[PDB]
Amino acid sequence: MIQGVIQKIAGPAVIAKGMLGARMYDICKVGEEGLVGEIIRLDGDTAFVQVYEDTSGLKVGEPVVSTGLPLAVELGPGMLNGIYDGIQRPLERIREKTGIYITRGVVVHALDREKKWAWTPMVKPGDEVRGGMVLGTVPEFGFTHKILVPPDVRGRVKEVKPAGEYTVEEPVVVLEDGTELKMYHTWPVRRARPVQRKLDPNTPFLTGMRILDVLFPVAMGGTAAIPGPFGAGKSVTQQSLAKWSNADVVVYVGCGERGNEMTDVLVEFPELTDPKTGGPLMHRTVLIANTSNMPVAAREASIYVGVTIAEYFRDQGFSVALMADSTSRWAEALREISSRLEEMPAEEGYPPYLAARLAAFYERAGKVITLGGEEGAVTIVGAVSPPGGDMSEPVTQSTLRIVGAFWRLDASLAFRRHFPAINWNGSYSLFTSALDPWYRENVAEDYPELRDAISELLQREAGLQEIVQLVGPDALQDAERLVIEVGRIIREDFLQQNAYHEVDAYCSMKKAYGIMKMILAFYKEAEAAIKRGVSIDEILQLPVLERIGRARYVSEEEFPAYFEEAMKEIQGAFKALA
Amino acid sequence: PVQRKLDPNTPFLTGMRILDVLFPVAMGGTAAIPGPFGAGKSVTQQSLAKWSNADVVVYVGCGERGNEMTDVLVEFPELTDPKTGGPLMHRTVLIANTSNMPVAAREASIYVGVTIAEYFRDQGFSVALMADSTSRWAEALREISSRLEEMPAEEGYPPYLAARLAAFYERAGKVITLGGEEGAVTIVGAVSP
Amino acid sequence: PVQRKLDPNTPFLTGMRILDVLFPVAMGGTAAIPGPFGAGKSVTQQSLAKWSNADVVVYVGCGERGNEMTDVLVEFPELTDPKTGGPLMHRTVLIANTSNMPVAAREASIYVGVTIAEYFRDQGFSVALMADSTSRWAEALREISSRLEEMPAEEGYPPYLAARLAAFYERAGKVITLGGEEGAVTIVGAVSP
Amino acid sequence: KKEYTGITYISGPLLFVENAKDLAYGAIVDIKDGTGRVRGGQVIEVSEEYAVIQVFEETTGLDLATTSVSLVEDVARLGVSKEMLGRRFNGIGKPIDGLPPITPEKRLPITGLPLNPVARRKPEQFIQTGISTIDVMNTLVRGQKLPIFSGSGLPANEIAAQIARQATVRPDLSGEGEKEEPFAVVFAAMGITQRELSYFIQEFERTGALSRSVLFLNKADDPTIERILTPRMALTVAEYLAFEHDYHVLVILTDMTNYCEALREIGAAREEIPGRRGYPGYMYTDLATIYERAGVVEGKKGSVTQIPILSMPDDDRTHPIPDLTGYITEGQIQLSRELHRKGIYPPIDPLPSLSRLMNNGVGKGKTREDHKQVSDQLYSAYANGVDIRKLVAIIGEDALTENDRRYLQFADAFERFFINQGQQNRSIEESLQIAWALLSMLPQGELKRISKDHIGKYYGQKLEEIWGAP
Amino acid sequence: DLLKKEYTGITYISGPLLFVENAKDLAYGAIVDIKDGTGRVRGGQVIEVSEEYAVIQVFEETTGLDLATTSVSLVEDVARLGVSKEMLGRRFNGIGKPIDGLPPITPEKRLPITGLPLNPVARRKPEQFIQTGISTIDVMNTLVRGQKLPIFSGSGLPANEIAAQIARQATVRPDLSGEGEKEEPFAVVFAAMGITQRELSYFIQEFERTGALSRSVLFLNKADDPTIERILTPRMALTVAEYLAFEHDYHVLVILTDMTNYCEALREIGAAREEIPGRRGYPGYMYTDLATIYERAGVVEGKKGSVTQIPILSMPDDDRTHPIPDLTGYITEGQIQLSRELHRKGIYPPIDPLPSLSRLMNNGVGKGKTREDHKQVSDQLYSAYANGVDIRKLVAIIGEDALTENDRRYLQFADAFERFFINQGQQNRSIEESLQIAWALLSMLPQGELKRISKDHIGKYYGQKLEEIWG
Amino acid sequence: IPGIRAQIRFIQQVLEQREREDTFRLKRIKGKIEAREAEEE
Ligand SMILES: Nc1ncnc2c1ncn2[C@@H]1O[C@H](COP(=O)(O)OP(=O)(O)OP(=O)(O)O)[C@@H](O)[C@H]1O
Ligand SMILES: Nc1ncnc2c1ncn2[C@@H]1O[C@H](COP(=O)(O)OP(=O)(O)OP(=O)(O)O)[C@@H](O)[C@H]1O
Ligand SMILES: [Mg+2]
């Protein structure tokens, strides 16, 4: 195979000579330790290699071999309830071999080769086969893992194995041409897994958070971005999405972030429950951890590994949520490598291709009909980390032009310990109009109008706040004061939400609808009272306000009775005055 | 070349009382007008063309929009010279450039205009030069500078912008030609920030 | 070299109430006095050199006016030492590299001044070092780095400016001398943002 | 034909090829790899020692030992035909609707030539978009460039689709006129997402607008060079139709912000020092070469009109893209976030909107006689109303005089019934009727900017005429 | 291994960089000795290797180096530090050589200074509450054992005093947690990067007063010391700290005095190397480099030791948007940000709680750890202080006469907060005292405004007046 | 209003300075690569 030697070592970058014939974006083994790398430039006989591990100690003259194939992921049973590195190495196995530290050059299989899986064949001899069709099933943590033909494989089936207990290395099915199909196949990460056809997003992605799921929703096949400065709550929001989202599988990609967050997920999620199937929450989760102090070149690989795993679970008919912990660190890694390549930068050091890469990543989302004819989806929720909190960075601006929802976080709110800490004025969604039928069917026939009424009230508050700053709250009339006060009620009792509570950490759609109805009814009553001359100061003391404010913490099961009583009490609190 | 430059001791009768009285310009002077939308800049410039005491009028649109350029190229033929009642264009040279013409032409527009004005001045005449949107010309200069990879000054303009502007404007003045006659070039430029 | 460094526990008396009361400096301390032009940096430092309680003063004019050095030379010979009662110049060392003198000599002036101050400290005196403009030393570094073609940090200054300033200021301190006597160097540094 | 195999360098989007002095500058090339896959590229530099190709799409499988380059075309050309109508392409002209490829009447270089200034003429006739706030207050005149400035979450795509489906000429309002004057719409989308693509396909298919439109859709995951080429091909087709078959083409360029970002990326890929704010120093000239392919020509019955739709990067008018677009174009239709959040669609704020050509396309013999004055009165009245709305929050409704209260109610009704027309297609007559109904609320004599005869003839109509069926 | 290979043939010396041509046998990252003509030996590290030459970053000044008599020799391929438990009580310099006159230490292991990533699977979740004795940290910005909680200081702000006080007062509360009651102290590793003599004198005097120099390792790079030696100092310190913690079951507290100086050294090297900068000239890899240091703290499953970091950095112009604080905050697990406004008013420790943060706080507070009302009390304190600041801004434009009664109560709360909770001087406040003060202050507000505190907690702790504590 | 105008002018000046420094750096590096190609290819 193509063999050469090292010419030059500068950080994660290795220049290899004697590599004529090496292909672009091929995996190569640098040095005697077989460090995995990727060819990013061909120059004469030379080849530029970015090494996915550390390079300290490497000398000039050590061998460099090209595998001949690009970065690939092993897809098959054995992935859920597991944590992987950026290039899909099981970290549990690495701890078993290494100690508490991650050492370089560990060769470990992505999927367990000894575990035995029960196989129920779905095909018989003489059956036609196409890529993506289902060859059988294999139970996995309460899921029915579907064995799928590789997307570019066809033919007829020679002999299917009888139902039994085998491993992923055994040819469960073999075709006429001699192709030996196993429980797992490999796929290049940088290639979008083919699908039959895309579908218009028309169902919501429930996140459990009121503000996101009500005012700034995201569809199942949708994409969202959550930018903010450090200390605003991106990680808490994304962990809440992992815990409480209505997806089937969750892929969490820790791209260049704190290792304590991955540790937190690993330690805590086994003690929690899956919202739908009721089992442990780690059974529906995959973790890709490439922390900040790990090799920088693998930050790029983490995103592709995560998206490919998500597309695989989508091809199995599931609905998947992909949580990219930081795309900003991916961009920073690209900038580092570009500096090693001595290229012309663009904007603040970023290479010209950053936006194309980001678009290619985000366009891999969506709701599809799989090649096998099921319906699966992938929802991407990426986080951006602008320097200084500035939203005019190239990464944040590029994300703005591709995502369907923008959850802008705010430093002023987080400083006040007001969470989720979402800036309402600078946030938006594009899936609201398309999700009206679903809301009418599954929440309430007038949910769209209540949501729009709250949007109207918040915009009225935003308009009046200019005058508030100019002259102060007392200078306003009574109706404007009521607009301000209802705005505060919405901020504190509806948009505010506590993630460390045993009740308010999750909110259903009907609970949000009930709270919104309570607020709208109160606003109408109070406006009428002001029209009949009641003093505004006397409205703020109506006891019903404490019930409206405490509704958040009511349990989900108890909520309907509380809400019926609250509507009765709202009618009473003004009816008595007459 | 000219034999001598003379002092500005004679007026440039624009025909408009406000300009000719409150803020007058001398023969061989220099003026500036901003162009805001709806301000009548077009009518004022056409009136300078019609009623000024200049024998020739050179009009330069360095980087105008296509529609403004067609407006000016459709209106000027329709005007009538008050002095003779013949077409005003018989004593006018029009230099027309649109935004999509080569940047070299848009930079050279004002120089072509000022050279032609100097030629008619040397023939013993009094010529009025009206350069519309010298800001677009400055934009052409800035693009050319970027193509040369020059270090800008201020809002990306090259550090020699003022030098070029002075070179263009100081070519105005009342003079005694090499033929011994008297002629002048009066420049009215427009700035559109 | 020195035997050991000590904790500043004696005031550096400047004769100016605001500095001596609200913002004191110890005898081996460091002070910076930035200000725009016309604020009183030079007058403040001259007053420090005239009335302070240092045995020796080393005044260093880097990239500043020559009239100031001329003023010092003309005036101090007819002024009295605060403590010893003799002429003021007899306790002053003047290092002058004015604005229009060679630029790279500013660095040498700073280093020469600090070294002479250290010498007199090693003789057991209390020495005040007045740097008239450290900004001009930074400018000299910037020019020399431009001739080296080094990649610049903020505002074109070389990325080691902070290190050089730190090394210069860290020569201040009250110390036990190699001969066992007690000495101090107090550096007041003017900055011209 | 002739294959070049001296590939000496591959890095990012560039590959160097030696002994290629026969490749013209800007020629389109094909790249075959070891697996036989064919990529595409463009010659970006030709020298006596090597040529530089810019590769569309990625450069994954390429190797220096099994890569060959062949010439496709010396000049990027587009095969245009009248059969293009009813078809959707991909930004380099390839069909993406599944239909057979067209047989061209001719092939034209996408980089058209500048129009001769002395061949132009004054725009003097209007296009009826069906939207009241544009038709009445910021009219559109054939040959104009009237961009839409929008924001991040605003519905610019929906407005684009609505104008695409509703835009028509009105030959009957211009004297007797000609009943048959062909009209076409060219819709150029740059860097759109899959959901937006599906939306556009559905919108064009449902109402039958496809039959009179040509679509050039470039996705955000498509190559950037295709994004740069898309507007040029759109305008090539538009010029062909207008100036060879007397069509009245309306061109919509969906996202010029995407085009500008792609332009900056391409410039940085060729080692160009960027200009102001990091954008190319020639962005002005490039935008001009796009925007100035519209107008009306002497002796030709056709015209080209442009509606470039750009998203204000951070709701900032001082940004390069909108500032330069303002230099080149004539006015702007400004979308307001306050109206959008208040629930008003289409959220066009008349106050910062301006149509620079409205005068020449409005008046007698084109529309109605009362159009200019009605627009002026609407503008002034709405401004007064917004002012009173701000003041009443501090002084109170009682403190206001009676005329001020009239202005308040007028502004509310204007927002509710004029701006907020939903998806309805309003003819100019219906819009003017609504305008007069809104103006009837103010007393006669406060209509200081409308002639007496117009007020007499059209004043008094109650709001019940349109309130019954809003 | 046992032989000395010497590389004459140096072709370049400029600033911090040295080029040596035929050095094809030098490993990337190796450590070398540079011997000049006079015999002085200077260090350096290989940061680029090729068949042409090797780039060496020098750790000292280049005065006296010539291209004829200068030579380069190898010390080791990977930079390792000799590590022994007997390093406690010793003072080392930036490159880890003794400066106290005692003999060089006999290593038990030679560990690489860069270290290795800690496996996320191996990590343990930090949950032990550390009582610092400072109310703003203890109640509202709780510090746990195994956390990276830096201090964001200014030019003249007293961050060093706060660090000394935290080291002096730190302790766990075994009684409140239910675990074994042990009184083992902290082992303090102290890394000074470009420290002035004034600050170093203060720190040394304070530690000597407290008798902590016996259980402390000091790595001192002063202001007169070479600038490029600062790249190694934090890594040496963290190597020692990790060794002690995860091989000898120590609870290590690491103080990194000035990370701004470290970042400046990084910028010097990167500028010499023509690295594409990020913002304000700092290298594009500064985030990764800072994470290689900060992320070396935590706790590991199945071991009793820990590492806790308290980095101190000075915000250049009190700018939180500057790259150094920005990246640090993106990496660390919170920050304690000082305020110059409170400093001018005389408040010590001048800690502004609104910009401060502690990520891991929720893991070390609550029932069974400190007390049940802790979290809600901190949330309510933030709410009330934010209201007070807003009302101050309102008064700045409208005047006190227009303030309603509730607004005046909030202003009075803000002033009392600043004067009695934030301002404590040098006093060790138990978490119970701090909670008591917080409660006495919250009692200045009507019962109903405490929306973040549960009704039962309000019943159990509301009402006590501030006079019962003082006066 | 004048104070906010002064603040705006200051911020705009700082941003222009940062842009100028970036352009200077880009010119340096482009010249570096060009000189590399011209001299040592
Ligand atoms: N001297 C004048 N006498 C009468 N009417 C005038 C006079 N000057 C201007 N006007 C009127 O005012 C209008 C001025 O606005 P208009 O839009 O026409 O200006 P413009 O000169 O074309 O502007 P710009 O050059 O900035 O594009 C003229 O069209 C005409 O209606
Ligand atoms: N303490 C003072 N008493 C009286 N006049 C003073 C005092 N300080 C400054 N001045 C006046 O201010 C003038 C300028 O002061 P000075 O020369 O010290 O400025 P500077 O801050 O050093 O500025 P520059 O950078 O221009 O040299 C002095 O000539 C004197 O007129
Ligand atoms: Mg001075």
Author numbering:
A (entry chain A): 1 to 578
B (entry chain B), C (entry chain C): 194 to 386
D (entry chain D): 5 to 474
E (entry chain F): 2 to 472
F (entry chain G): 169 to 209
Quote the study on this structure.
Vacuolar/archaeal-type ATPase (V/A-ATPase) is a rotary ATPase that shares a common rotary catalytic mechanism with FoF1 ATP synthase. The thermophilic bacterium Thermus thermophilus (Tth) possesses V/A-ATPase, which functions as an ATP synthase in vivo. In the V/A-ATPase, the V1 domain (A3B3D1F1) can function as an ATP-driven rotary motor and ATP binding, ATP hydrolysis, and ADP/Pi release that occur simultaneously at three catalytic sites of A3B3, respectively. This cooperative reaction produces conformational changes in the A3B3 stator, which induces a 120° rotation of the central DF rotor.
In structures reconstituted from 30 K particles, ATP molecules were identified in the catalytic sites on both ABopen and ABsemi, and sulfate was confirmed in the catalytic site on ABclosed. V2ATP is an intermediate structure formed immediately after ATP binding to Vsemi1ATP, since the catalytic site on ABopen of Vsemi1ATP is immediately occupied by ATP under saturating ATP conditions. Similarly, V2ATP is in the state immediately after ATP binding to the catalytic site on ABopen in Vsemi1ATP (middle). The catalytic sites on ABopen in both V1ATP and V2ATP are filled with ATP because ATP binding to ABopen is not a rate-limiting step. Two maps of V2ATP and V3ATP showed an apparent density for ATP binding to each catalytic site on ABsemi when contoured at 7σ (standard deviation). The atomic displacement (B) factor of ATP binding to ABsemi in the V2ATP and V3ATP was in the range of 30 to 59 and 41 to 77 Å2, respectively, although Vsemi1ATP showed a higher B factor range of 112 to 133 Å2. V2ATP disappeared in the resulting dataset from the reaction solution after 30 s, while V1ATP was still identified, indicating that V2ATP is a short-lived intermediate compared to V1ATP. This observation implies that ATPase activity lagged because of a delayed transition from V1ATP to V2ATP via Vsemi1ATP in the initial reaction.
